[PDB]
């Protein structure tokens, strides 16, 4: 219960005290207190996972498997820890053993499914969810129905130039979300799924209202915040979107999530926070420099800031010198991306198109270095006049 | 495994005494708000558009 309350210290103390006392009470019914010790060991292992004492988490799961090896939850947590290590291979190895122990276990299929979905293996991922609904023990699993809906929706995020493939998937996803919401009126994901397909269908007006109505029940679904923030960007209420992305980053991510940071950068660009847009993308490049889409966005912000500095002759020398080198760096980055860019993440014509605009503005930028020097001298005359006039008094 | 399979009943014993309220089905359910009536009212509007009315 303390774990459920987030009282990791108390949970640790109480589970440890429970195990130490359990050795004393096991004297009455060793089998029963051994079962209790399994529950206490699992609860403590799950806490150590949350507390990052992974050697003790690993050892406790292994202890349960040493004493009670059919406890599927140990295999799944060992795999989930591998997933947290980012080791989809090791994670799948542990989840596969869980399926080899109980082929109809829905979380084992789902965990491997998460590995397939993260890897864009929509077909193989789909296999995991389809296998669950046909079995009587899981024939009513809304999670799997919604998972098929999510598979179709995830395919909707990838660009197929023939809209019918996407639209065929749209109707597949929507039929699932419509029925699931009919069967379970508290279903958060069916409602959001309807909103998601309406949004893909372009019905942002209703989709926003739906995402808002889903948000009224819970503050812990980031996608609802993200969908609302995206529509706020599309509806040009950029301040609200920026505020959602900033607080979303502070609440849900223990690190700067580049997806949210990019959504924030897109809003900040339009929000006029060009300084923060620049800083946010520089932070993003500092976090994921091999991601060429973020690198492009950095070059784009440098280009857009320089465009403003270069248009108005009131801009000073430090601003112009920064704009020249920053714009040279941006052109250099687009030129670099044209040679080292990751072709699978962005449209190749985009980098070549922006590179030209940067080179053009850099050519015009050299004049401003000479222009800026006079503006500094212009005030000195008034100051000299002020000095002699002060001597007059 | 002939020696391990004999304890699946023990794992069932543990699981029979163990209780968790948040599951893959209940994790998908709201704390108290029912969405059906509003979203179906929205679908009343959307269904007409999907049928081209």
């Amino acid at each position: 219960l303390h774990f459920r309350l987030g009282n990791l210290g108390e949970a640790k103390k109480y589970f440890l005290a429970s195990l130490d006392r359990a050795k004393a009470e096991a004297e009455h019914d060793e089998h029963y207190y051994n079962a209790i010790s399994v529950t206490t060991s699992y609860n403590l292992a799950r806490l150590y996972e949350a507390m990052c004492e992974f050697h003790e988490a690993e050892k406790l799961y292994k202890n349960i498997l040493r004493e009670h090896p059919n406890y599927v939850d140990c295999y799944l947590r060992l795999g989930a820890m591998a997933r947290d290590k980012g080791n989809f291979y090791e994670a799948s190895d542990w989840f596969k053993e869980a399926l080899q122990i109980n082929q109809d276990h829905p979380d084992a299929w789902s965990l491997i499914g998460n590995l397939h979905l993260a890897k864009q293996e929509w077909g193989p991922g789909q296999k995991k969810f389809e296998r669950i609904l046909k079995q009587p023990s899981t024939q009513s699993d809304t999670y799997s129905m919604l998972a098929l809906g999510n598979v179709w929706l995830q395919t909707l995020h990838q660009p197929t130039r023939d809209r019918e493939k996407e639209k065929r998937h749209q109707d597949r996803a929507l039929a699932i979300y419509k029925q699931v919401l009919r069967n379970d009126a508290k279903n958060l994901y069916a409602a959001n799924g309807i909103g998601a397909v309406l949004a893909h269908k372009g019905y942002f007006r209703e989709a926003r209202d739906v995402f808002a109505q889903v948000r009224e029940a819970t503050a812990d679904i980031s996608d609802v915040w993200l969908n609302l923030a995206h529509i706020y960007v599309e509806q040009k209420q950029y301040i609200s979107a920026v505020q959602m992305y900033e607080n979303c980053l502070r609440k849900f991510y223990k690190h700067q999530n580049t997806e949210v940071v990019l959504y924030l950068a897109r809003a900040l660009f339009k929000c006029g926070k060009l300084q923060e847009c620049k800083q946010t993308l520089l932070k993003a490049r500092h976090v994921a420099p091999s991601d060429t889409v973020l690198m492009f966005n950095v070059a784009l912000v440098l280009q857009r800031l320089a465009t403003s500095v270069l248009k108005d002759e009131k801009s000073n020398l430090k601003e112009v010198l920064n704009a020249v080198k920053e714009l040279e760096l941006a052109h250099r980055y687009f030129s670099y991306l044209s040679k080292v860019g990751d072709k699978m993440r962005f449209d190749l014509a985009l980098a070549a198109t922006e590179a030209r605009q940067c080179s053009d503005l850099l050519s015009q930028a050299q004049y401003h270095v000479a222009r800026a020097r006079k503006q500094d001298e212009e005030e000195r005359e008034l100051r000299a006049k002020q000095e002699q006039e002060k001597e007059l008094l | 495994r002939s020696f391990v399979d004999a304890e699946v009943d023990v794992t069932r014993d543990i699981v029979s005494r163990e209780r968790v309220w948040r599951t893959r089905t209940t994790i998908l359910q709201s704390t108290g708000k029912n969405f059906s009536k509003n979203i179906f009212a929205i679908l009343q509007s959307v269904k007409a558009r999907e049928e081209g009315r």
Binding site: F3, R4, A11, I36, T39, Y42, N43, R46, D73, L76, R77, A80, D107, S110, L111, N114, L146, A147, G149, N150, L153, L156, H157, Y189, N192, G193, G195, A196, V197, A199, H200, A207, S222, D223, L226, N227, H230, L262, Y263, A265, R266, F269, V293, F296, N297, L300, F346, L350, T353, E354 | R17, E18, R19, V20, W21, R22, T23, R24, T26, I27
Partner: peptide, 27 residues
Amino acid sequence: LPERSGVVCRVKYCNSLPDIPFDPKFI
């Protein structure tokens, strides 16, 4: 005229599955 270039971000309307609830077990 070339349609105004926005920040390069692939639009995703998501409905992400929640993490599987492996919460500590009551006895």
